[PDB]
Design a protein around this ligand. Structure first.
Ligand code: HEM
Ligand code: HEM
Lengths: 376, 375
């Protein structure tokens, strides 16, 4: 009975009608490949050519996504494989609008992210004119889809940066409904709004614009990507109770400190007999709580990444962090401000090395994502 | 019915007693992480310290391997996961013996690989004193096991290079028993000797040494690893028939050209009505055939890798090639010489960018791999 649950993600097709696009709601597949692209020159250097280039890329990816969602990848590489929940998300960067001389079409929510004091960003791992998020429950299905999509729009597009990520597969999960863990061992995702709830929808969806020139993003979502390296050598030096105090939750059960189940509320007022706070003043979940951030909320849909070791022998692995929200100004941005400015204990164990913001529009029946922008 | 088949690799434990070590025979898990290590510099520049460091690393990995095989990874990262066929292989490079001032313990089979004319090797991605091959049907189980093993022997060891690879998962396979494909779309593994038969064992197993100094490798196997980049952009320009001519087999069925089924024997004498060879004179499978190589053969147990795009724009993806044999001189080496010297049609679509040779000793009772050598 759990056996069908364990096979379900590999067996089924994704819901291609998921809003605003696939890759946000629903069960997340075990594998992801996030790819940021720039428009190639000299098309990018002339606004009319850039608009034409954007149209070409966005339409082409939308056409292939339709076929991939319905039939899977074309190649022999994916022959004999099940659909594996293959899903394609298409996004647009603020710099695309700049290249098209279309700053008047740029919603306030697409403003560049602030610099933060803890940033350790590599410029070539940041930003991008365009984005594909490709996901699947199988890495061969995924690689075939990725190669197809990237080759389809060459040479009008060029890859700027990309990163592959994973979670545990449903097939190897004792409970395929359990929330996934990250490479620090932590259950990661608990506080996300439930998939049922209207709260999920309110959290990820952009409210209608007051300016009609910005309305192409009505019903869309914004994605903030952060490539966050984990300092696992330093992390391993900590005993379990200290690791738990960095976050504010138990490692084994995922329960808040002071609680007993993963789903128990995080009680931030709880004190010991001697007056000490049970969850420390610098605990991650204390500083990230919506109540500490003017009500700010997001859906975190991240993946683990493992890129081995760098030339100095330091581990290059971490969290491919992905936050979805209707407006970064009331989602990622204030929360990240709190983590940085209020001294999140997790700061000392992490390094943000890549970053991007993308607008992910909703497209009607017979249109491609961004068609309202490019043809408007 | 096939449902249980699809779940089996994720559900089961690996056979910890597989010979000479796990990771060579048996069903291969969907994920691999190959890690090459060097002794750290305190340990390495003095033979007495190097011998101590080698014993420490090999014993520790063996102890952890036993626990991993039995109960899975310790860490919370793999909590709530099934065993996923987790398996650990431990290997030794010739350079370890040099560091230990034990060069005369190196069997002939551990001699450095030749340079080949097509080599495009980056030094940072070649060699190593020591090797771990860690495999599992799940990437989270794999990553937890890897983090445990690498941490266990730090700082006596340091990572020199590593590469992660994948195959299709059993869970997503229409037929979990079908042979896996590579990123060029080709069925890959067909001509490997069958596992339940004498030829497989003769092919992978080092025969007993003439001299006690080399007996530590009796019954072991040798791994040749090659990181082979595929020129996939160039490959895509070819139509299907021309792709098939590069290899000598059909893409859809995996049959030899001229045949109907994957398992049909290759007919290297066949010609068409024009007098044209059915399998091209430079087809990969023609040049790689044991009878073009005085009987040389090997067991190929490779994985696909995907490392995105380099700064120069090139797609960094391909085949993590892994050949197992009792002696590289009667396996990988003479075959590679043929592919290079006779102009394999596949050469122009591939670049060998990393390479290593490791000795993988036979496991015994309550000893660790290499204990015969280090003690
Ligand atoms: C490698 C870096 C990070 C790690 C390991 C991490 C880990 C965690 C963990 C274990 C939890 C508790 C379980 C849960 O509710 O999901 C959590 C909660 C949370 N994190 Fe992070 N996180 C990281 C980065 C970030 C960043 C950059 C942000 C936003 C800017 C963020 C925002 C949040 C939020 C909003 C919660 C839920 C708070 C609540 O309402 O209880 N996290 N994180
Ligand atoms: C990216 C590089 C390579 C690719 C894509 C590739 C692919 C293939 C394919 C598709 C086959 C036919 C199916 C099979 O029998 O497995 C094959 C056969 C074979 N390959 Fe390769 N190969 C590569 C590199 C090598 C290298 C470097 C060697 C040895 C030095 C090698 C040795 C062999 C052998 C011995 C066979 C079986 C020949 C026979 O007895 O029929 N391959 N390879």
């Amino acid at each position: 009975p759990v056996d069908a649950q364990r096979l379900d993600m590999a067996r089924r097709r994704a819901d291609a009608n998921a809003a605003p696009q696939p890759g946000i709601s629903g069960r997340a597949p075990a594998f992801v490949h996030v790819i940021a692209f720039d428009l190639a020159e000299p098309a990018r250097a002339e606004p009319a050519a850039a608009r034409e280039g954007a149209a070409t890329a966005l339409r082409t990816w939308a056409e292939h996504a339709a076929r991939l969602h319905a039939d899977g990848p074309e190649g022999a590489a994916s022959a004999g494989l099940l659909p594996a929940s293959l899903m394609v998300t298409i996004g647009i960067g603020g710099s695309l609008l700049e290249a098209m001389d279309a700053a008047d079409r740029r919603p306030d929510a697409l403003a560049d992210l602030p610099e933060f004091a803890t940033d350790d960003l590599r410029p070539r791992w940041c930003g991008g004119d365009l984005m594909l998020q490709v996901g699947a429950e199988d890495p061969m299905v995924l690689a075939a889809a990725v190669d197809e999509l990237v080759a389809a729009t060459a040479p009008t597009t060029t890859v700027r940066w990309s990163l592959r990520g994973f979670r545990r597969t449903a097939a190897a999960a004792q409970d395929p409904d359990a929330t996934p863990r990250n490479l620090m061992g932590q259950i990661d995702g608990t506080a996300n709004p439930a998939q049922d709830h209207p709260l999920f929808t309110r959290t990820v969806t952009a409210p209608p614009a007051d300016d009609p020139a910005h309305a192409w993003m009505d019903g869309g979502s914004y994605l903030v990507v952060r490539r966050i390296r984990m300092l696992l050598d330093e992390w391993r030096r900590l005993d379990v109770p200290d690791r738990e105090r960095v976050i504010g939750r138990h490692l084994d059960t995922g329960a808040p400190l002071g609680g007993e189940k993963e789903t128990d509320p995080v009680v931030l007022t709880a004190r010991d007999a001697d007056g000490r706070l049970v969850i420390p003043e610098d605990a991650h979940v204390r500083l990230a709580n919506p109540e500490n951030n003017l009500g700010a909320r997001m859906v975190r849909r991240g993946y683990n990444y493992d890129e081995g070791w760098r030339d100095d022998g330091v581990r290059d692995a971490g969290l491919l962090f992905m936050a979805w929200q209707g407006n970064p100004a009331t989602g990622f941005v204030p929360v990240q401000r709190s983590l940085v400015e209020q001294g999140d204990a997790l700061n000392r164990y992490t390094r943000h090395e890549g970053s991007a913001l993308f607008a992910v529009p909703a497209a009607t029946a017979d249109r491609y994502p961004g068609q309202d922008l490019v043809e408007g």
